[PDB]
Design a protein around this motif. Structure first.
Motif, PDB file in Angstrom:
ATOM      1  N   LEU A  87      92.626 -14.654  61.624  1.00  0.00           N
ATOM      2  CA  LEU A  87      93.104 -14.295  62.960  1.00  0.00           C
ATOM      3  C   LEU A  87      92.063 -14.383  64.083  1.00  0.00           C
ATOM      4  CD1 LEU A  87      95.155 -11.145  61.931  1.00  0.00           C
ATOM      5  CD2 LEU A  87      96.110 -13.391  62.510  1.00  0.00           C
ATOM      6  N   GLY A  88      90.792 -14.220  63.747  1.00  0.00           N
ATOM      7  CA  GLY A  88      89.771 -14.288  64.776  1.00  0.00           C
ATOM      8  C   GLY A  88      88.734 -13.210  64.555  1.00  0.00           C
ATOM      9  N   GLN A  89      87.729 -13.155  65.422  1.00  0.00           N
ATOM     10  CA  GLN A  89      86.673 -12.161  65.280  1.00  0.00           C
ATOM     11  C   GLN A  89      86.908 -11.000  66.219  1.00  0.00           C
TER      12      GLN A  89
ATOM     13  N   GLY B 157      95.697  -2.482  53.364  1.00  0.00           N
ATOM     14  CA  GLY B 157      95.367  -3.626  52.539  1.00  0.00           C
ATOM     15  C   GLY B 157      96.220  -4.868  52.709  1.00  0.00           C
ATOM     16  N   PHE B 158      96.672  -5.134  53.933  1.00  0.00           N
ATOM     17  CA  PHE B 158      97.466  -6.331  54.194  1.00  0.00           C
ATOM     18  C   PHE B 158      96.638  -7.341  54.988  1.00  0.00           C
ATOM     19  CE2 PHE B 158     101.925  -5.069  53.151  1.00  0.00           C
ATOM     20  CZ  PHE B 158     101.695  -3.729  52.847  1.00  0.00           C
ATOM     21  N   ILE B 159      95.465  -6.915  55.444  1.00  0.00           N
ATOM     22  CA  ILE B 159      94.550  -7.770  56.196  1.00  0.00           C
ATOM     23  C   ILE B 159      93.136  -7.498  55.711  1.00  0.00           C
ATOM     24  CG2 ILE B 159      93.571  -8.297  58.420  1.00  0.00           C
ATOM     25  CD1 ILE B 159      96.141  -7.638  59.686  1.00  0.00           C
ATOM     26  N   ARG B 160      92.248  -8.479  55.808  1.00  0.00           N
ATOM     27  CA  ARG B 160      90.883  -8.270  55.339  1.00  0.00           C
ATOM     28  C   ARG B 160      89.858  -8.596  56.421  1.00  0.00           C
ATOM     29  NH1 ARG B 160      93.698  -9.659  50.310  1.00  0.00           N
ATOM     30  NH2 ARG B 160      93.243  -7.959  48.836  1.00  0.00           N
ATOM     31  N   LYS B 161      88.776  -7.826  56.473  1.00  0.00           N
ATOM     32  CA  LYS B 161      87.745  -8.037  57.489  1.00  0.00           C
ATOM     33  C   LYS B 161      86.405  -8.556  56.964  1.00  0.00           C
ATOM     34  N   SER B 162      86.363  -9.839  56.598  1.00  0.00           N
ATOM     35  CA  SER B 162      85.136 -10.464  56.090  1.00  0.00           C
ATOM     36  C   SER B 162      84.217 -10.985  57.198  1.00  0.00           C
ATOM     37  CB  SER B 162      85.477 -11.625  55.162  1.00  0.00           C
ATOM     38  OG  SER B 162      84.305 -12.364  54.873  1.00  0.00           O
ATOM     39  N   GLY B 163      83.182 -10.210  57.524  1.00  0.00           N
ATOM     40  CA  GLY B 163      82.259 -10.602  58.577  1.00  0.00           C
ATOM     41  C   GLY B 163      82.860 -10.373  59.958  1.00  0.00           C
ATOM     42  N   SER B 164      83.544  -9.240  60.126  1.00  0.00           N
ATOM     43  CA  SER B 164      84.176  -8.895  61.397  1.00  0.00           C
ATOM     44  C   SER B 164      85.178  -9.991  61.759  1.00  0.00           C
ATOM     45  CB  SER B 164      83.105  -8.760  62.489  1.00  0.00           C
ATOM     46  OG  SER B 164      83.665  -8.321  63.710  1.00  0.00           O
ATOM     47  N   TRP B 165      85.627 -10.708  60.733  1.00  0.00           N
ATOM     48  CA  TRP B 165      86.574 -11.806  60.896  1.00  0.00           C
ATOM     49  C   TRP B 165      87.910 -11.558  60.228  1.00  0.00           C
ATOM     50  CZ3 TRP B 165      86.898 -16.968  62.764  1.00  0.00           C
ATOM     51  CH2 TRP B 165      85.960 -17.216  63.784  1.00  0.00           C
ATOM     52  N   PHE B 166      88.853 -11.051  61.017  1.00  0.00           N
ATOM     53  CA  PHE B 166      90.203 -10.725  60.570  1.00  0.00           C
ATOM     54  C   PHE B 166      90.959 -11.846  59.851  1.00  0.00           C
ATOM     55  CE2 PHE B 166      89.943  -6.993  63.536  1.00  0.00           C
ATOM     56  CZ  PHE B 166      90.269  -6.031  62.580  1.00  0.00           C
ATOM     57  N   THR B 167      91.749 -11.460  58.838  1.00  0.00           N
ATOM     58  CA  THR B 167      92.512 -12.406  58.030  1.00  0.00           C
ATOM     59  C   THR B 167      93.744 -11.842  57.331  1.00  0.00           C
ATOM     60  OG1 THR B 167      90.526 -13.674  57.503  1.00  0.00           O
ATOM     61  CG2 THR B 167      92.441 -13.930  56.043  1.00  0.00           C
TER      62      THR B 167
END
Ligand SMILES: Nc1ncnc2c1ncn2[C@H]1C[C@H](O)[C@@H](COP(=O)(O)OP(=O)(O)OP(=O)(O)O)O1
Length: 305
Positions: A275-277, A259-269
């Protein structure tokens, strides 16, 4: 004579009697002693429970060919030396490739390598080196290649040959503080299976491509035998063709479940700054700004030990 109260008393009497963790409780999150050698694989690191190979213990790492066993072990050497350690390699397969190694952090030019002529020879020039109290780590290549003197001359030992060397050499590196890595490849391993304090099961799961020529592969390691931390835990990681364990890639696999990064629409954050797709596009993003990757390693190194 309460149950739990009566259990722990008779239970602690064992560790006394046979060893530190002869009887472990699978959930326990106990942590003490440490003195470990990072495997450069955060994931795997935690898997062990103490973050890396316990120094001063015989470790086994089996698995079929191409599996990436050597790689791990070598990684273990990079670390063990990148901290002023003396490495010893007992090559008996003669398959070792320097170029690749040096690309992992290994100080080749100051690495001990030895190519014995017989099983006995290997198991001695190694045991001896261990008693020299100078080595920090020492891998032996291919438990199998360790053929008895005969069966090379005239004409089952080995199941005996191994047994002997161990009994002797287990006590030796036991109070030397030099971790011995053996390398199986799915015999004598009917004893190594009983000496090792940690035995690893390296086996290649997937293949990491991008419509390209494939390169590395998603490796799964299951730590079936552990005597310091609780056994049976497991972890996966990426091994890039000619480059090694994707520290960065491992950082995402771990930075997404924790839970330190999130994947909204195969889009890292990572908290407000994307960060990118995809994945191969994200590991490429950290491979650049290390301070960003550093935070996450520094962050996961907190959520756990
Ligand atoms: N000859 C090579 N050329 C380029 N890359 C290689 C080569 N050999 C291995 N690699 C890299 C990419 C492979 O996916 C990865 C496999 O892990 P490695 O630990 O080297 O295999 P292994 O230990 O399971 O097989 P082996 O029994 O031959 O040692 O290492």
């Amino acid at each position: 004579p309460d149950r739990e109260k009566a259990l722990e008393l008779a239970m602690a009497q064992i560790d006394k009697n046979f060893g530190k963790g002869s009887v472990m409780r699978l959930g326990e999150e106990v942590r003490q002693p440490i003195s470990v050698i990072p495997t450069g694989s955060i994931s795997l690191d935690v898997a062990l429970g103490i973050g890396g190979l316990p120094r001063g213990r015989v470790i086994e790492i089996y698995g079929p060919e191409s599996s990436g066993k050597t790689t791990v072990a070598l990684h273990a050497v990079a670390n063990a030396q990148a901290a002023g350690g003396i490495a010893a390699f007992i090559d008996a397969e003669h398959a070792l490739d320097p170029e690749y190694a040096k690309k992992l952090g290994v100080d080749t030019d100051s690495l001990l390598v030895s190519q014995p002529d017989t099983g006995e020879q290997a198991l001695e020039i190694a045991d001896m080196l261990v008693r020299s109290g100078a080595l920090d780590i020492i891998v032996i290549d291919s438990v199998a290649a360790l053929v008895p003197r005969a069966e090379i001359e005239g004409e089952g030992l080995q199941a005996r040959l191994m047994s002997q060397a161990l009994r002797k050499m287990t006590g030796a590196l036991n109070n030397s503080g030099t971790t011995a890595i053996f390398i199986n490849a799915l015999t004598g391993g009917k004893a190594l299976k009983f000496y090792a304090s940690v035995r690893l099961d390296v086996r290649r799961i997937e293949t990491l491509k991008d419509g390209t020529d494939a390169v590395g592969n998603r490796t799964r390691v299951k730590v079936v035998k552990n005597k310091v931390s609780p056994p049976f835990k497991q972890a996966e990681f990426d091994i890039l063709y000619g480059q090694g364990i994707s520290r960065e890639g491992s950082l995402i696999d771990m930075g997404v479940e924790h839970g330190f990064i999130r994947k909204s629409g195969s889009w890292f954050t990572y908290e407000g700054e994307q960060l990118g797709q995809g994945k191969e596009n994200a590991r490429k993003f950290l491979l650049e700004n290390t301070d960003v990757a550093n935070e996450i390693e520094k962050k996961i190194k907190e959520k756990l030990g």
